[PDB]
Amino acid sequence: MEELEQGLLMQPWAWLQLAENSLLAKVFITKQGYALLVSDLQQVWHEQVDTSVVSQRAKELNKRLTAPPAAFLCHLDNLLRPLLKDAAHPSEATFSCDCVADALILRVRSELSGLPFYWNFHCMLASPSLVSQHLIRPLMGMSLALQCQVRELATLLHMKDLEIQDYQESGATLIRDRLKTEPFEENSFLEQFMIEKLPEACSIGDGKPFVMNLQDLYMAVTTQHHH
């Protein structure tokens, strides 16, 4: 069922307030299972699931609950909103995380209608061909795309100075020395940046920045590949 994955790509990353840790992931749920991809910037993870295991794992955790194999994912799907949705939440849905040799358990455990709604995540070490299509490749295109964005944008900044010329080359002094801006010298600006902004701009932190101001692009790129 390669149907699942297909959607996992578009779905951008996000942040997740884990009980102790914190990792940016992406999940895609359907009526026939889900395909969650998580990572902590040090190593990716992934877990595929189909209706079968869903209901199976269901009673193995939500024993007091007897829910239809397909419907479960449907409800759980609506529960997972502490990412895309408001950064607030998720009520009492404290995400427990533990690691054990390529294994990563995302013991959700929240509330449902006022009852103890449980659910775990058996995400194994993500595969190469996978990481390549979610981090490496896609993201790589971003940096390669942003660079091309700076040049065309900065070069357009040159036209601003070029126009200012005719105004200045003919008296007509500005009305406020305030707006008066120094001529944009691509070489200059680009050398100081690596000594002022970059030092804290490159800071990947824990991936949080990545999600808060890049997905807008990320999605528009990863999708542009299969087209």
Partner 1 sequence: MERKISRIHLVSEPSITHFLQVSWEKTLESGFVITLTDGHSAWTGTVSESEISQEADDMAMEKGKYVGELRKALLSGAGPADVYTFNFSKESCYFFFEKNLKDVSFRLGSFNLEKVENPAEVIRELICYCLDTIAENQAKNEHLQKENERLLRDWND
The single residue among 1, 19, 41, 71 that binds partner 1, judged by CB under 8 A, is 71
For residue 128, is the peptide bond before it cis, meaning its omega torsion is within 30 degrees of 0?
Answer: no
Q: What number of other Cβ atoms are within 10 A of residue 135's Cβ?
A: 16
End-to-end CA gap in the chain: 21
Residue 218, amino acid: Y
The single residue among 2, 20, 42, 66 that binds partner 1, judged by CB under 8 A, is 66
- Give the integer Cα–Cα distance in Å for 41 and 129: 17
* Residue 64 makes contact with its own copies by CB under 8 A: no
Pairing mode, if any, of strands 29-30 and 103-105? Answer: unpaired
Pairing mode, if any, of strands 122-125 and 44-50? Answer: antiparallel
Q: Minimal distance in Å, beta carbon 84 to partner 1?
A: 19
Residue 70, amino acid: A
Binding to its own copies, residues 176-195 (CB under 8 A): 176, 179-181, 184, 189-190, 193-194
The single residue among 10, 18, 67, 214 that binds partner 1, judged by CB under 8 A, is 67
* Residue 75 makes contact with partner 1 by CB under 8 A: yes
Per-residue x/- track, 119-158, its own copies (CB under 8 A): ------xx-xx-xxx-xxxxxxxxxxxxxxxx-xxx-xx-
Give residues after which the chain gaps, C-N over 2.5 angstroms.
Answer: none
Residue 222 exposed, middle or buried by CB count within 10 Å (0-12, 13-18, 19+): buried
By beta-carbon proximity to partner 1, the closer residue of 22 and 96 is 96
Q: Minimal distance in Å, beta carbon 120 to partner 1?
A: 13
Residue span binding partner 1 (CB under 8 A) among the ranges 57-65, 94-102, 131-139, 170-178: 57-65
Binding to partner 1, residues 81-120 (CB under 8 A): 111-118
* Residue 32 makes contact with partner 1 by CB under 8 A: no
Check residue 17 and report its DSSP letter: B
Q: Minimal distance in Å, beta carbon 219 to partner 1?
A: 29
By beta-carbon proximity to partner 1, the closer residue of 44 and 93 is 93
